[PDB]
Design a binder for this molecule. Structure first.
Ligand SMILES: O=c1[nH]c(N2CCC3(CC2)CNc2cccc(Cl)c23)nc2c1CCCC2
Ligand SMILES: [Zn+2]
Lengths: 162, 47
């Protein structure tokens, strides 16, 4: 039930999303070990993910959360990197996409820094890198991230030493 | 999956040591996120 719509690089929506990718790169304290060494991306394609069932499942929960949080869904746009991107866009997020060993418990994790999510495209801590070259810093192979609509509602603030 | 703290719908992980690191967020129900955009890209070797 999922359709993917290519956006044109001449489209304002493409440029907007690219700018969100590019402007939220940072350096990482691992020196690039997990996600590679880079300051910017080459954006190759941006697709809108269209799935009526998954969207209505999302907006149904969004309204519940809003009503429990003084009418504020606290909706953000956040990055998610995962080896399971193809399953996520067809079936949605579920517990099998959860970070079992994540610092805040077994949940689904998102980042404001695109480069944080880039650390997980090939696995936890970058895994063994790209499947072709086994290179966590591969400049050749194409990577995929998700830029996701996320309902936070009332968010528990946890000051981590990261 | 685990649960969010009672009375909450998510967790905000706010880095308190790296001033340049932005926040990370956790949800505990898949229905609270929609994968809106699929972005294909390469990282670029610094000049
Ligand atoms: O975008 C993000 N994705 C993740 N994942 C957690 C690990 C996970 C892929 C997704 C989940 N289960 C599993 C099993 C096998 C391999 C892998 Cl890689 C994964 N964690 C984070 C961010 C950004 C914020 C910091 C944490
Ligand atoms: Zn490669």
């Amino acid at each position: 039930g999922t359709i993917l719509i290519d956006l044109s690089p001449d489209d304002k929506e493409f440029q907007s999303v690219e700018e969100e990718m590019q402007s939220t790169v940072r350096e990482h304290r691992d020196g690039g070990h997990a996600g590679g060494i880079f300051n910017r991306y080459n954006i190759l394609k941006i697709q809108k993910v269209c799935n009526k069932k998954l969207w209505e499942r999302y907006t149904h929960r969004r309204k519940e959360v809003s009503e429990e949080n003084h009418n504020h869904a606290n909706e953000r746009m956040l990055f998610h990197g995962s080896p399971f991107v193809n399953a996520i866009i067809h079936k949605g997020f579920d517990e099998r996409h959860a970070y079992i060993g994540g610092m805040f418990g077994a949940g689904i994790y998102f980042a404001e820094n695109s480069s944080k999510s880039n650390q997980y495209v090939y696995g936890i801590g970058g895994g063994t890198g790209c499947p072709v070259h086994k290179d966590r810093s591969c400049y050749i192979c194409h990577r995929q991230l998700l830029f996701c609509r996320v309902t936070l509602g009332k968010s528990f603030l946890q000051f981590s030493a990261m | 999956m685990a649960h969010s703290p009672p009375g909450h719908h998510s967790v905000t992980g706010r880095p308190s040591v790296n001033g340049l690191a932005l926040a990370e967020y956790v949800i505990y129900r898949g229905e609270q996120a929609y994968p809106e955009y699929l972005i294909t890209y390469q990282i670029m070797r610094p000049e």
